[PDB]
Design an enzyme around this catalytic site. Structure first.
Site, PDB file in Angstrom:
ATOM      1  CD  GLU A 127      -3.213  -0.627   0.199  1.00  0.00           C
ATOM      2  OE1 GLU A 127      -3.191   0.501  -0.347  1.00  0.00           O
ATOM      3  OE2 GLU A 127      -4.123  -1.451  -0.006  1.00  0.00           O
TER       4      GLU A 127
ATOM      5  CG  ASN B  94      -8.320   7.065  -4.457  1.00  0.00           C
ATOM      6  OD1 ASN B  94      -7.565   6.272  -4.978  1.00  0.00           O
ATOM      7  ND2 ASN B  94      -8.456   7.156  -3.153  1.00  0.00           N
TER       8      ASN B  94
ATOM      9  CG  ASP C 253     -13.579   8.945  -4.835  1.00  0.00           C
ATOM     10  OD1 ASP C 253     -12.369   9.200  -4.638  1.00  0.00           O
ATOM     11  OD2 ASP C 253     -14.259   8.319  -3.999  1.00  0.00           O
TER      12      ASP C 253
ATOM     13  CB  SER D   1     -11.537  10.023  -1.587  1.00  0.00           C
ATOM     14  OG  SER D   1     -11.086   8.864  -2.269  1.00  0.00           O
TER      15      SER D   1
ATOM     16  CG  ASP E 212      -6.357   5.841  -0.871  1.00  0.00           C
ATOM     17  OD1 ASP E 212      -7.496   5.819  -0.380  1.00  0.00           O
ATOM     18  OD2 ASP E 212      -6.130   5.423  -2.016  1.00  0.00           O
TER      19      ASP E 212
ATOM     20  CG  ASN F 143     -10.813   6.694   0.600  1.00  0.00           C
ATOM     21  OD1 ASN F 143     -11.972   7.079   0.677  1.00  0.00           O
ATOM     22  ND2 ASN F 143     -10.043   6.946  -0.456  1.00  0.00           N
TER      23      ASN F 143
END
Ligand code: CL
Ligand code: NA
Length: 129
Positions: A35, A46, A48, A50, A52, A59
């Site tokens: 990750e 991301n 959308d 958002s 991480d 998120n």
């Protein structure tokens, strides 16, 4: 902070992740590897809107507030920036909430795609625990 493999395993163990909800330590270390590459400061945006955050890429739409993800919830009740610290406490506390959320470690796409169904124990072999 960029953790060493065994150093992270030890910290994760101290924070009670070993066999947490039935996931051995190997799974957590493997997930952190793919990750964030063991880097507490990792951020990824991301499509959308958002983002991480941190060692386990938590998120901003569901788990933390970064002040720029509209209609987000803040279920771990923390600013996302606290997930970037060299102290992994907030990340671990929030991940415990995530993994208990019914879908287990499948909430982490890298775990599902690159750890699940592999020999995860190899990620802590060699370490003093
Ligand atoms: Cl599960
Ligand atoms: Na949010």
């Amino acid at each position: 902070k960029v953790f060493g493999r065994c150093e992270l395993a030890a910290a994760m163990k101290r924070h009670g992740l070993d066999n947490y909800r039935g996931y051995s330590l190997g799974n957590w270390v493997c997930a952190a590897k793919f990750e964030s590459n063991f880097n507490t400061q990792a951020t990824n945006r991301n499509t959308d809107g958002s983002t991480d955050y941190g060692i386990l890429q938590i998120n901003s739409r569901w788990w933390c507030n970064d002040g720029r993800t509209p209609g987000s919830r803040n279920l771990c009740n923390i600013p996302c920036s606290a997930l970037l610290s060299s102290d992994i406490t907030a990340s671990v506390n929030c991940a415990k909430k995530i993994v208990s959320d019914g879908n287990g470690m499948n909430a982490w796409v890298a775990w599902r795609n690159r750890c699940k169904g592999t020999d995860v124990q190899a990620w802590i072999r060699g370490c003093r625990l």
